[PDB]
Design a protein around this ligand. Structure first.
Ligand code: GTG
Ligand code: SAM
Length: 260
């Protein structure tokens, strides 16, 4: 029915090699070699990011989609890539990161990058069961992929309901992952949230062609439906004519040390 529904069906039909070629086609990508090399040797002192995910929040911040300010809540922080990026920013006073930590390599990793001493992590935290707390900047990077679009729809709606709960009057800045934005129920929900909170939706170019994820952000106003369909059309175009090639750029590097 929607363009994004056509995209998901066709994606699931792709052959193994077609899939691998398509997923990286014309996407942007950070080179993670330096970070991985330093992490393998346990070098927590060096100015590197713990995850690939940090490239998404840098693009959001640097391109004017998101201000990062005051007390920041990082929901679904995982390793801490968004938390440590935030801690390094001028206007930030503290970061609190919450994550399930269901798997070992998805638990917070301590670093000594700038402002590490103003970050607190709590793993074994379900942000859906816990009471909300005030924030000036609310981040949420939750949404597990599924080949089943109905599963992805439910996951997305669950994340958006909890976001509305966590989103306080209080909260000026926000960035929330919308796993599968193309579902009519998801669009209708985002539209009512936009009436309440403002903002708009953006597609981060570091996302792989194999997911339709977009981000609901405070920093811009735009038409939800127009933005989602434009992404759907881009992803379909890339499928019929796949370059099989990502544009590689430099990773997220950080200053190091404590902040007062
Ligand atoms: C395998 N597969 C999937 N689809 C379809 O594509 C969608 C996206 O999932 P896809 O596996 O990229 O991503 P995830 O489900 O999130 O898994 P995963 O690799 O575990 O990604 C999650 C984790 O990977 C981590 N990650 C980051 N960088 C890398 C990396 O460079 N390599 C790997 N393996 N993981 C990375 C990242 O941090 C994140 O936590 C699925 O829903 C299906 O519709 C397929 N379709 C066809 N036709 N053929 C296929 O073989 C096929
Ligand atoms: C995409 S990862 C976070 C990546 C992170 N922004 C980074 O750059 O390192 C999403 C994380 O959210 C966590 N998560 C999923 N559901 C959650 C829940 N209900 N409460 C807290 N964390 C959750 C997952 O365990 C996963 O590690």
């Amino acid at each position: 029915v929607t363009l994004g529904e056509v995209w998901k069906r066709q994606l699931n039909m792709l052959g193994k090699q077609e899939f691998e070629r398509y997923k990286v086609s014309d996407i942007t990508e950070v080179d993670r070699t330096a970070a991985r090399r330093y992490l393998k040797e346990g070098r927590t002192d060096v100015g590197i990011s713990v995850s690939r995910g940090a490239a998404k929040i840098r693009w959001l911040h640097e391109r004017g989609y998101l201000r990062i300010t005051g007390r920041v809540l990082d929901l679904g922080c995982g390793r801490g890539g968004w938390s440590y990026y935030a801690a390094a920013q001028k206007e930030v006073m503290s970061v609190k990161g919450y994550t399930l930590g269901i798997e070992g390599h998805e638990k917070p990793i301590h670093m000594q990058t700038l402002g590490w001493n103003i970050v607190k992590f709590k793993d074994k935290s379900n942000v859906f069961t816990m009471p909300t707390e005030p924030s000036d900047t609310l981040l949420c990077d939750i949404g597990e992929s599924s080949s089943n679009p109905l599963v992805e729809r439910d996951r997305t709606m669950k994340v958006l309901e909890n976001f509305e709960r966590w989103k306080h009057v209080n909260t000026e800045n926000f960035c929330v992952k919308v796993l599968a934005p193309y579902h009519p129920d998801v669009i209708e929900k985002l539209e009512r949230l936009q009436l309440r909170f403002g903002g708009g939706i953006v597609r981060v170019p570091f996302s792989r062609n194999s997911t339709h994820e977009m981000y609901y952000i405070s920093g811009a106003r735009n038409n939800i439906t127009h933005m989602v369909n434009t992404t759907s059309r881009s992803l379909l175009r890339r499928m019929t004519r796949p370059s099989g090639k990502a544009i590689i750029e430099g990773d997220v590097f950080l200053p190091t040390g404590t902040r007062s």
